[PDB]
């Protein structure tokens with residue numbers, strides 16, 4: 001427990017044009033527990049050879065997953081994202097459709113960990129490193145080794161440092177597992193988010209947060225562990241344990257989270273800048289959306305492939321912003337960049353003369369304008 005339902009978002013990276021190669025993205029989020037089945041379908045057949053990020057979660061602790069593959073839109077062929085979850089009666093198939101528009105400061109670095117305990121002697125585990133919303137690391141479970149997803153994932157650390165880190169992680173895992181395997185009278189899931197935010201001005205902000213069955217359990221605030229008020233005897237127990245019984249583990253954590261993490265983080269940024277990519281022009285295109293009702297249209301404006309994140313997108317009549325404009329979420333793209341789509345609902349007659357306007361930092365001040373037409 002408890003149960004949350006997956007939001008499902010399907011979208012293409014480029015304008016859809018028959019025979020021309022494209023990328024199909026599927027973003028599955030908001031779910032809990034972590035047990036899930038996601039498949040990209042072509043004409044009902046599951047597509048093998050797809051890319052998927054490792055499992056992560058939000059501040060809410062709900063899980064999310066990115067999927068994508070290469071595909072070609074055609075007149076005949078039908079594509080879908082198929083999801084199966086404990087909160088679904090039947091599997092949900094959401095089609096991708098050109099004419100529906102797809103269907104549906106500070107930097108931070110964190111290590112994310114999910115533990116799934118079905119019983120005493122059976123448990124799943126997985127973890128991964130994330131630079132902002134960008135995964136930079138996986139973790140091989142059998143070997144107990146780090147997986148560096150990119151040419152810069154090492155981030156200006158020597159090999160000795162990272163070896164020591166691997167072993168530190170190994171023993172940390174052995175420790176907690178033994179620790180959770182004790183305390184036995186029972187299905188449950190444990191999530192850990194640990195790492196650092198780096199802020200303008202250089203002040204690091206450390207965090208180590210745990211959750212249980214998707215519930216806020218404990219955290220680490222300024223050299224002292226804190227329980228989230230349940231109460232909460234479990235959290236208070238384990239906190240108290242860490243605070244005193246074995247302190248010195250927290251010396252490591254404290255060091256690791258206030259030092260090494262911001263240094264590694266900065267190392268990633270440095271090594272990252274070499275390859276790509278400072279700024280990227282989006283491309284934009286219009287499509288219809290799902291019909292809002294008889295005698296009404298939904299206009300969809302797609303903005304895809306922009307980086308950095310900040311965008312301004314609006315439906316216009318001349319200089320007048322449209323009141324009804326609805327901005328979707330900013331979603332991740334196949335390799336690194338960003339996707340967003342804005343919709344508007346309008347009567348048939350009032351469709352003509354509406355424009356979608358895009359402002360991005362990389363456009364050099366010359367905005368993208370797209371005019372609706374039939």
Ligand SMILES: CCCCCCC[C@@H](C)CCC[C@H](C)CCC[C@H](C)CCC[C@H](C)CCC[C@@H](C)CCCOP(=O)(O)O
Pocket residue numbers: 111112113114125126127128129137138139141146147165169171172173175176177179194195249252253256257259260261262264
């Ligand atoms: C099966 C799940 C595997 C999960 C491992 C996935 C790891 C996967 C992301 C590899 C990326 C590695 C990445 C390249 C190097 C980043 C270096 C950063 C600065 C280190 C931050 C380490 C975290 C913050 C401290 C952990 C808390 C433990 C030390 C204390 C706990 C109490 O002890 P106890 O338990 O004994 O009682």
Ligand SMILES: *[C@@H]1O[C@H](CO)[C@@H](O[C@@H]2O[C@H](CO)[C@@H](O)[C@H](O)[C@H]2NC(C)=O)[C@H](O)[C@H]1NC(C)=O
Pocket residue numbers: 118119120122
């Ligand atoms: C956790 O629950 C039981 C605990 O033993 C596991 O039971 C095993 O189930 C599979 C297939 O049914 C096999 O490993 C054996 O038949 C069972 N083991 C024993 C010792 O009887 C179970 O598989 C674990 N997790 C599940 C069922 O998801």
Ligand SMILES: [Cl-]
Pocket residue numbers: 048049
């Ligand atoms: Cl293959």
Ligand SMILES: [Cl-]
Pocket residue numbers: 073074077096097098
């Ligand atoms: Cl289509």
Ligand SMILES: [Cl-]
Pocket residue numbers: 259260263
């Ligand atoms: Cl260090």
Ligand SMILES: [Cl-]
Pocket residue numbers: 286287288373
């Ligand atoms: Cl159109």
Ligand SMILES: [Cl-]
Pocket residue numbers: 308309
């Ligand atoms: Cl960004």
Ligand SMILES: [Cl-]
Pocket residue numbers: 009104328329
């Ligand atoms: Cl959306």
